[PDB]
């Protein structure tokens, strides 16, 4: 019985899968092609676990999950036995996304809850949490993705149809908002920064209004460029939008039971692939 898992994540080396469903449990599997052997079940949430997410193995085996009970739960495998080492629930509503930073930033976490907040939880020397939060969106935040870089930034997708790009500032000590972008007529479900250290940067912003805008910034200066992936509404509401590391392929999880794939061509416009 597992009729509706909401999220699954793969580890750096892809040996250990972590699905999370609505029955609150987070199941860990030892994958091996056809055979993912169930190795664990983790019960510690008071509502459907929306998302799970491993951290960089530089930090051992850590997994921050966020669930409907408004609480972010950090887990850790310890000698082959899992244990909830920390927790961070400074959010007064259902926590939706949770995504670790680039490991060069430390062990930073990115939480994004319906109380219009998004936190960046550091784990200090005592391993204890150091929350520095910001208000992100009015009617709630559905997602928040990290950006790689070599001047840190992230993106957030809102319930007010916004897509925001925040940046760290030593003057403020809290992430200062630097640019917001408007293009959807309904809850911005998911937002994704692309890991392509190439000439430009790409953002795929899927939404409830069955659109997927792509914000391509020329460089550090010139603002973004709006590009409706295709100019027809998808047969059903879109949920997830993920970039590929090698290649800059875009995967779109629409509520129409297939996942589409879009690649950029020399026109600059995007074309299906599969």
């Amino acid at each position: 019985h597992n009729e509706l898992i909401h999220d699954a994540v793969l580890d750096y080396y892809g040996k250990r899968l972590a699905t999370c469903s609505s029955d609150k449990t987070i199941k860990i599997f030892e994958v091996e092609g056809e055979t993912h052997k169930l190795i664990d079940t983790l019960t510690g949430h008071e509502g459907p676990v929306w998302r799970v997410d491993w951290a960089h193995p530089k930090f051992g085996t850590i997994l921050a999950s966020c669930s409907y009970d408004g609480k972010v739960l950090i887990w850790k495998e310890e000698n082959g036995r899992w244990s909830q080492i920390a927790v961070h629930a400074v959010h007064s509503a259902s926590v939706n996304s949770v995504q670790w930073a680039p490991h060069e930033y430390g062990p930073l976490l990115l939480v994004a809850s319906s109380d219009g907040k998004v936190s960046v939880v550091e784990f200090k020397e005592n391993g204890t949490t150091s929350p520095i939060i910001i208000d992100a969106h009015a009617i709630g935040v559905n997602s928040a993705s990290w950006a790689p870089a070599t001047s840190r930034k992230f993106v957030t997708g809102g319930a007010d149809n916004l897509v925001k790009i925040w940046k760290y500032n030593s003057d403020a000590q809290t992430y200062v908002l630097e640019s917001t972008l408007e293009g959807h007529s309904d809850w911005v479900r998911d937002v994704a920064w692309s890991p392509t250290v190439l000439l430009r940067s790409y953002l795929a912003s899927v939404s409830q209004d069955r659109t997927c805008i792509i914000w391509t910034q020329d460089n550090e200066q010139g603002p973004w460029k709006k590009t409706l992936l295709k100019e027809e509404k998808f047969p059903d509401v879109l949920w997830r939008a993920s970039w590929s590391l090698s290649g800059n392929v875009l995967a779109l999880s629409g509520g129409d039971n297939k996942v589409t794939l879009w690649k950029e061509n020399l026109e600059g416009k995007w074309e299906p692939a599969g």
């Binding site: 898992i5 994540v9 080396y13 899968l17 997830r240 993920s242 999880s253």
Partner: peptide, 23 residues
């Protein structure tokens, strides 16, 4: 509802209620 992101080993996990894991 569906979910799908790209793997480290650039490949794709999707909701799949036909396997064992749900992906």
């Amino acid at each position: 509802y569906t979910f799908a992101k790209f793997s480290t080993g650039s490949m794709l996990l999707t909701k799949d209620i036909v396997g064992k894991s749900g992906v």
